[PDB]
Subunit: 388 residues, 4 copies
Amino acid sequence: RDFNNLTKGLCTINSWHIYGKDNAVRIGEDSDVLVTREPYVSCDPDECRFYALSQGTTIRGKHSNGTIHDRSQYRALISWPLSSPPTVYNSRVECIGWSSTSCHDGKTRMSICISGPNNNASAVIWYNRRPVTEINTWARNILRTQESECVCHNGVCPVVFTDGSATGPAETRIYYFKEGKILKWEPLAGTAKHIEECSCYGERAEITCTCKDNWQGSNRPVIRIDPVAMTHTSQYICSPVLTDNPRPNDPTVGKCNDPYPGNNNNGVKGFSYLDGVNTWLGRTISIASRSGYEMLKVPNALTDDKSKPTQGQTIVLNTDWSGYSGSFMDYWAEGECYRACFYVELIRGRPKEDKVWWTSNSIVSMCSSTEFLGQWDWPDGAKIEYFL
Amino acid sequence: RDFNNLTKGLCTINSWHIYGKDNAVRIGEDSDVLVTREPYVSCDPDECRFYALSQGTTIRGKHSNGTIHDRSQYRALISWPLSSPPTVYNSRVECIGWSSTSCHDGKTRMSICISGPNNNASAVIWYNRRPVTEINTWARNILRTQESECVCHNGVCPVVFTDGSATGPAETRIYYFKEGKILKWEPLAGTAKHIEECSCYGERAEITCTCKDNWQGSNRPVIRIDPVAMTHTSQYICSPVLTDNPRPNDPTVGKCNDPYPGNNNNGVKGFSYLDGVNTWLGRTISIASRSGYEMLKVPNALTDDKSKPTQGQTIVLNTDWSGYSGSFMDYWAEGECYRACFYVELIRGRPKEDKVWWTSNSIVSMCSSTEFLGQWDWPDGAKIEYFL
Amino acid sequence: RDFNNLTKGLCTINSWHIYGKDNAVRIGEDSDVLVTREPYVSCDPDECRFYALSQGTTIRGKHSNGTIHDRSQYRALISWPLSSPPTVYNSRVECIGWSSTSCHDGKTRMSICISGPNNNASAVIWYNRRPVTEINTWARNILRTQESECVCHNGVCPVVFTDGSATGPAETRIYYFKEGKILKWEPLAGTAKHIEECSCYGERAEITCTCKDNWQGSNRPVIRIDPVAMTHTSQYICSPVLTDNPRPNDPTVGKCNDPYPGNNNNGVKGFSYLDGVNTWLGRTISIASRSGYEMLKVPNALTDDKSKPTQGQTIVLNTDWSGYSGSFMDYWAEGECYRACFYVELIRGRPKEDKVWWTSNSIVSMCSSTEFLGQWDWPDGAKIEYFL
Amino acid sequence: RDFNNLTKGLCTINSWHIYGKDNAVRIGEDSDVLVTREPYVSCDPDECRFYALSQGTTIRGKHSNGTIHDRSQYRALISWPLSSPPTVYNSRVECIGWSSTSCHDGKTRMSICISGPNNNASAVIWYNRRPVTEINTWARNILRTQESECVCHNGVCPVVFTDGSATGPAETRIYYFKEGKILKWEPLAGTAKHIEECSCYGERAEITCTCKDNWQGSNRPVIRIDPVAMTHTSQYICSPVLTDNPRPNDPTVGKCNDPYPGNNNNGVKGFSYLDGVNTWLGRTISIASRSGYEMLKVPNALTDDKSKPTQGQTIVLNTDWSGYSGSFMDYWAEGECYRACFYVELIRGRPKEDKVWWTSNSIVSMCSSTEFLGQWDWPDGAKIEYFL
Ligand SMILES: *[C@@H]1O[C@H](CO)[C@@H](O[C@@H]2O[C@H](CO)[C@@H](O[C@@H]3O[C@H](CO[C@H]4O[C@H](CO)[C@@H](O)[C@H](O)[C@@H]4O)[C@@H](O)[C@H](O[C@H]4O[C@H](CO)[C@@H](O)[C@H](O)[C@@H]4O[C@H]4O[C@H](CO)[C@@H](O)[C@H](O)[C@@H]4O[C@H]4O[C@H](CO)[C@@H](O)[C@H](O)[C@@H]4O)[C@@H]3O)[C@H](O)[C@H]2NC(C)=O)[C@H](O)[C@H]1NC(C)=O
Ligand SMILES: *[C@@H]1O[C@H](CO)[C@@H](O[C@@H]2O[C@H](CO)[C@@H](O[C@@H]3O[C@H](CO[C@H]4O[C@H](CO)[C@@H](O)[C@H](O)[C@@H]4O)[C@@H](O)[C@H](O[C@H]4O[C@H](CO)[C@@H](O)[C@H](O)[C@@H]4O[C@H]4O[C@H](CO)[C@@H](O)[C@H](O)[C@@H]4O[C@H]4O[C@H](CO)[C@@H](O)[C@H](O)[C@@H]4O)[C@@H]3O)[C@H](O)[C@H]2NC(C)=O)[C@H](O)[C@H]1NC(C)=O
Ligand SMILES: *[C@@H]1O[C@H](CO)[C@@H](O[C@@H]2O[C@H](CO)[C@@H](O[C@@H]3O[C@H](CO[C@H]4O[C@H](CO)[C@@H](O)[C@H](O)[C@@H]4O)[C@@H](O)[C@H](O[C@H]4O[C@H](CO)[C@@H](O)[C@H](O)[C@@H]4O[C@H]4O[C@H](CO)[C@@H](O)[C@H](O)[C@@H]4O[C@H]4O[C@H](CO)[C@@H](O)[C@H](O)[C@@H]4O)[C@@H]3O)[C@H](O)[C@H]2NC(C)=O)[C@H](O)[C@H]1NC(C)=O
Ligand SMILES: *[C@@H]1O[C@H](CO)[C@@H](O[C@@H]2O[C@H](CO)[C@@H](O[C@@H]3O[C@H](CO[C@H]4O[C@H](CO)[C@@H](O)[C@H](O)[C@@H]4O)[C@@H](O)[C@H](O[C@H]4O[C@H](CO)[C@@H](O)[C@H](O)[C@@H]4O[C@H]4O[C@H](CO)[C@@H](O)[C@H](O)[C@@H]4O[C@H]4O[C@H](CO)[C@@H](O)[C@H](O)[C@@H]4O)[C@@H]3O)[C@H](O)[C@H]2NC(C)=O)[C@H](O)[C@H]1NC(C)=O
Ligand SMILES: *[C@@H]1O[C@H](CO)[C@@H](O[C@@H]2O[C@H](CO)[C@@H](O)[C@H](O)[C@H]2NC(C)=O)[C@H](O)[C@H]1NC(C)=O
Ligand SMILES: *[C@@H]1O[C@H](CO)[C@@H](O[C@@H]2O[C@H](CO)[C@@H](O)[C@H](O)[C@H]2NC(C)=O)[C@H](O)[C@H]1NC(C)=O
Ligand SMILES: CCC(CC)[C@H](NC(C)=O)[C@@H]1[C@H](O)[C@@H](C(=O)O)C[C@H]1NC(=N)N
Ligand SMILES: CCC(CC)[C@H](NC(C)=O)[C@@H]1[C@H](O)[C@@H](C(=O)O)C[C@H]1NC(=N)N
Ligand SMILES: CCC(CC)[C@H](NC(C)=O)[C@@H]1[C@H](O)[C@@H](C(=O)O)C[C@H]1NC(=N)N
Ligand SMILES: CCC(CC)[C@H](NC(C)=O)[C@@H]1[C@H](O)[C@@H](C(=O)O)C[C@H]1NC(=N)N
Ligand SMILES: [Ca+2]
Ligand SMILES: [Ca+2]
Ligand SMILES: [Ca+2]
Ligand SMILES: [Ca+2]
Ligand SMILES: [Ca+2]
Ligand SMILES: [Ca+2]
Ligand SMILES: [Ca+2]
Ligand SMILES: [Ca+2]
Ligand SMILES: [Ca+2]
């Protein structure tokens, strides 16, 4: 009943344990499972749930045809019980739109959905399941946001938005909301040259967001926000362990204040936990496509431009499809530290599997362990041939 | 735990933002979605839900054949979570019947359902999910009511009913209920000549209802109710911007105290927000059929017989089917004013799409913003060819 | 939180209004609706629900074949929200068995299910959703009970059971339970010669049960129970308006203390409200089969052997199938009197409709009004041809 | 709100009454029922639920093919309302994995799921629906646990795990958890030579577990745990009434401190209630396959190596398939004693019914009665031919 404060630091990450997995595409082959994409996980004080952008049709439905498309009037942010699949009957609509973010401040939840045509989109900010504030596009070119949870501190929940070209300079803004109202907003500052789809987490009154430089960088831009002062900084992960996709092969020295070149106008949402020697980066295994997923322990990745891995864990084999990935934590758990968690979107269907006419995904999610646990791989598990 | 009082005025409407959309016909192509019509939205102090008259069959079910019919023994008022579709498994039956209204008074909900043959229908008034009062037909010709939410003030919830011919003078009554009991009723007074399907909202201890003159008027009749004195007045929207359907082309001067002629014996349920310069009217785009939907800002529409639009917003393109529309507000929201909202029923199937043997709909709903937001169009989205 | 006491009398019954209807067979043609039979309605202090004996299969399922059978290991007492259909996903299992009763005492619910082979059945009495007491068959011939709600007074909930032949003298017992424990039991006394499937209601600290004399009577046996003294009496409804089925044509004088002859070894569960001039009897319209349903006002039917109808209401046309019927009331409603209610089981399938291989039903239920309301008829509504 | 203490003794078992049955395979022939195996039952202070390991697909789904397999990435521990079937829409995922246990301590529930490849599995211990502790494999050979509920006393919930060969000596550990944290662990001691899948219950501050000696014994190993001292003992049921499967014919003298020989490297999870003369053993009827199920009253079975049955009850006929069986009790029921309960997994499909490509099960469960109740048999009830 009081706003949550980010008073703890991250727990020591020595490995990752399975947290949730919905097997949605497998189950949806013969049950009323909604087509989704851009999933994430977010916790309330008494429950943690899966979230995603529905496409407003089931996977077996005839309206699944054409669901590779990103922005239609039939999309909505939905949430559903942890590890169940997103069904027609258990999915709760949080708001209507084709780009979203959502977070609980300790008292209630803020959810944000953006909708509209490319040149006239608008964000609606919901708080306590009611619409409170609206924001019109400022650059008239696909106003858009995180696609994973936001983070709050003493009621202030910063959110990163981008409006403008995805393949050149754009207008990124950091909005500071409280009870769904705008306290302040600032234009992006720092050395990040382009920002998309930030994945954020909080610890010791600081919010760290790992984003995607769609324009030029194969290294990831990082925004660090002070939610009390309502100010931020930006840079890139200095490490040569490159974590966007597609991307060039890893070098031996990265770039701290500029995009690491080699691949232009493409990328995938991803994340990292940046905490000195307790630093872990996620990335696709393939440098060319959204296939495979691994976690690499890269001490001081944010600030050391020669930092390389000292430990790792395979999450998804390179022979299995992956997709977006993002961070979340259960800020209401017991204990002295916050346990880092992440999800990986396992994309099925188009464009990589074009024998089917749809595009959907399932979710797998892990949280850190202080033990050094054995590893397994966690594929989507569905057989495309069954849907033919 | 206290009855709600209409103490606030309307927020300034500068545009409309998306509030909810269930994509029911799209989803129902491959899931157990009930056939409905005559939908609406209504809020409780802790939740807002979609409501509609079920036809007692799913859309893919063989019993969907013949659902163009208005009044069968298989209909019921159902409610379901905001923006989910009306499924067999998540729909809550409020009462049995083929005409309804429902509203929360701040303590609990009153729901009214009318059933019976044309010459012997009766209304049952439920309060706190129990039947409390019954009213027999008084004119023996399809006793019927709003098809959208009623409004309460200090426990008094006025409801408009009509019994008698739909194409000549009829017997309209305004009932004032409190805890599901009849405090008083009055025959319609004022200059409205015929009343059907009123759409109501409340602000500053006054309830305004925009209804449909099925007999002669293409302008809409308006009933204004004082819920404390339990008295009312009636007139027509004076504006030349005609909002029924079908309707003749717009003139330059309307009629305040008589039906605007040109079209007889037909009409569609609709609504308006009448608040001086903050006045917005909804209407179908087509003058001939239930196609398209737009909101027009028409300053002083109620009292100015030459008032024309000063701003507008397209909700549904004229190349997409629309249908009934009505008003509702979240009277339990935070803030200093009541935010105007509306829904549009998107009718699919018969009679306009007769390759299918059913008639159903989906819902789209918006609420006002004080920003001037970009506009999008919101069609039902289902492909009729898939149901063949 | 206190046990309910039967302190009120019945409201004056001047007509019947629609209360609930699930349209289960119609909806179940294309959705996962369980096959049932022997339904009823029962209220808790905060909700009223539909109850029935599942057959442990959906209607469209291949295991629906053979569901005319009464007693299998796949049956269970289930409950579900008022007017929704009994689906796989919303049905709550109360206990396992093929004969049941259930009632709320004001604090929590007692549910009783009987299971077993014909010569070795046993009743399990559940209280607060936990098994508390068990009763073994005493006559080794289909131990069985009401098939509709029981009634409680100050925690004492009497229940009528029968064990022994259905076509000759049997051993009927009245058990008085409190918190699921046996306080006392008594053998049937009075002039009723055979008792089956009692339908009960309570008012002014007396419980009245209208049962079925399967052996010889076409008039119905009546048991009146004093739940404080834990004693009872039995007789038959004296009226010549005969209410079992099948039955001979109505005479002009009935029998008070013996079975009215003409039909042997058959019958249907039914009910009545016996309250002086406020007396209403339900019955099938047909004298030969379970078809049609009507309510007849028969002043002093219990004690006047020449009493005939003074008013009536058709519930189901004689061209539509009916079935079991029973009484229930919402003992937790507001107001000064208890409103009489009843349900009618609308049986579909075998044996009357043998083109399908299943037997199921839907439910329709009404409650009394003090108004003289217009009447409608309420058929099941499903088209058997669709299931072929 | 206080930890539960095992202060009561067992009620006198004079017979068994039906408690729950989900008919999952029958219902799942035409509804969205998940494929499962390794089910169990466990109670919270306010509800009792069915639990099982999902296979992450429905039974009618094409992904049901291959579900004989024990350990995939698509398995999860799920729970669902007592006697309903495990559907896609009502099943709650407790954790991800292919081996589990779960128990309520009076304050909240602890659930444990093991996942991973055979040589690198790990257990995750959840408490209050959040991950708290992780345990890595210690013998690198299928770390695994009970497959039925654990038992708590004053917050201490002992759990038995095994890691290592299933057909030779292995490394069994007894972990003592409290609030999901490890208080202590001990290696197995006593004369049991191999332990698998323990079935446990508690009474008078002692926890008794009946397990399976997969390696050499056809008699069952028994572990008795003192949850206060956090110590244990082990032996075998001395009785000649052999209760594993497959097994040799019963001798006249059993073995107390060594495996009863005749069958190697196979077995089925089972259980017993060991309480002096109030001792009842469950077993398959067949000595060769998982067919039939019976309860036998065998006074002093644990300590008397010549003890034979004095009473019995058939649960499942030998012409019907059975499977795993385990113990649970409602520790929060009213009364002076704990009522012994058990479930039997009714396995359908492979390997015994190989015309279908799946393996699943339904559940039947009973609790003891102090009456001597008539017996019935409770088969799964589904017709395999319908799934072809
Ligand atoms: C039971 O489970 C346990 C626990 O999971 C298992 O133990 C785990 O085993 C893992 C696999 O060996 C291991 O993970 C590796 O950790 C390495 C770090 O450790 C080593 O180095 C440190 C530092 O010197 C030592 O202290 C330590 O002792 C070790 O020697 C990582 O380096 C590994 O990652 C690299 O390899 C994999 C391929 O295996 C790549 O996918 C990965 O991206 C890394 O390599 C690429 O990137 C680097 C960095 O730029 C390049 O230098 C390199 O050339 C590669 O680049 C190519 O590939 C990438 C990706 O495609 C591409 O972008 C690029 O352009 C190039 O083409 C790996 O993470 C766990 O740490 C270990 N855990 C523990 C606790 O022990 C155990 O095996 C299991 N048991 C059984 C029996 O199965
Ligand atoms: C990004 O989004 C923003 C925000 O949504 C977009 O900006 C919006 O743009 C809208 C479209 O232009 C605009 O809506 C129009 O507003 C007009 C009022 O503004 C004009 O007049 C006022 C008053 O003088 C000026 O102050 C102002 O500056 C403007 O000049 C309305 O008049 C418009 O409605 C009329 O036109 C549409 C067709 O476009 C009809 O559907 C509608 O019914 C109205 O016209 C009929 O009715 C009138 C009244 O009787 C008749 O006079 C007229 O002849 C028409 O009658 C025929 O048609 C009807 C209907 O079929 C029939 O019944 C009748 O019989 C006749 O056959 C319209 O509402 C928004 O206000 C504007 N918002 C803002 C904040 O700017 C922006 O464009 C987007 N950007 C991009 C790049 O897309
Ligand atoms: C709008 O709705 C309103 C309200 O519903 C409608 O008004 C209702 O109209 C109903 C139909 O007319 C009416 O119900 C009838 O009531 C009769 C009692 O009223 C009459 O008698 C009293 C006493 O003298 C007068 O005071 C009063 O003014 C009336 O004259 C009942 O007697 C009626 O039931 C009998 O008829 C029906 C057939 O219509 C049978 O189904 C029924 O079982 C009864 O008859 C059988 O049983 C009796 C008793 O033994 C026998 O004597 C008789 O021969 C019949 O027996 C055969 O049939 C049975 C059944 O199959 C079989 O077992 C037996 O062996 C024999 O074969 C009937 O109940 C409502 O009371 C009335 N309500 C009000 C408030 O007015 C209005 O019409 C609607 N408007 C429109 C325009 O539709
Ligand atoms: C109404 O319901 C009531 C209540 O349920 C019914 O009454 C019940 O009737 C049951 C069936 O008769 C009965 O159960 C039997 O109880 C026997 C114990 O009672 C007898 O012995 C005691 C001790 O002397 C006496 O005091 C008592 O009066 C009785 O005489 C058990 O011994 C029975 O189990 C044995 O038989 C069944 C076959 O019927 C086997 O399945 C079972 O495993 C037992 O036999 C095997 O095991 C023993 C022990 O090692 C061997 O000695 C024996 O040779 C068998 O071994 C072969 O088979 C096993 C299993 O396949 C295999 O592993 C082995 O290698 C060998 O091949 C049985 O449990 C209930 O107690 C009784 N209840 C009451 C309260 O009365 C009533 O009948 C019903 N009414 C109607 C009309 O139906
Ligand atoms: C709506 O207005 C009525 C007064 O007109 C308020 O009613 C009073 O409420 C208080 C609190 O329960 C009582 O002590 C009075 O007896 C109430 N009755 C009247 C008629 O005076 C009501 O509280 C107002 N609602 C809200 C939400 O404030
Ligand atoms: C189970 O036994 C323990 C005592 O061994 C009880 O614990 C005490 O409970 C009271 C009430 O909360 C506290 O004041 C004590 O501090 C508790 N702790 C101990 C270890 O003493 C517990 O209440 C018992 N459970 C029930 C349901 O009675
Ligand atoms: C055109 C801008 C893109 C972000 C860099 C685009 N975002 C939106 C709001 O459309 C994403 C991108 O095209 C898709 C992907 O790369 O997987 C997802 C897609 N995201 C969503 N549909 N929500
Ligand atoms: C005959 C009277 C009509 C109202 C003016 C009629 N109302 C009823 C209760 O039947 C409506 C009208 O026929 C249909 C429509 O125009 O869309 C809906 C239909 N409304 C409903 N079925 N609830
Ligand atoms: C053989 C005894 C009958 C009661 C007089 C019989 N009751 C039971 C428990 O089987 C009923 C009768 O055969 C069926 C009917 O007449 O509709 C229902 C059937 N009732 C149930 N299946 N619950
Ligand atoms: C290889 C070890 C076996 C236990 C002795 C094995 N356990 C696991 C975790 O795989 C079980 C056994 O193979 C199957 C059975 O006998 O029915 C179930 C299977 N149990 C599970 N799948 N959970
Ligand atoms: Ca470089
Ligand atoms: Ca990039
Ligand atoms: Ca004019
Ligand atoms: Ca009109
Ligand atoms: Ca289906
Ligand atoms: Ca006679
Ligand atoms: Ca009879
Ligand atoms: Ca021996
Ligand atoms: Ca063995």
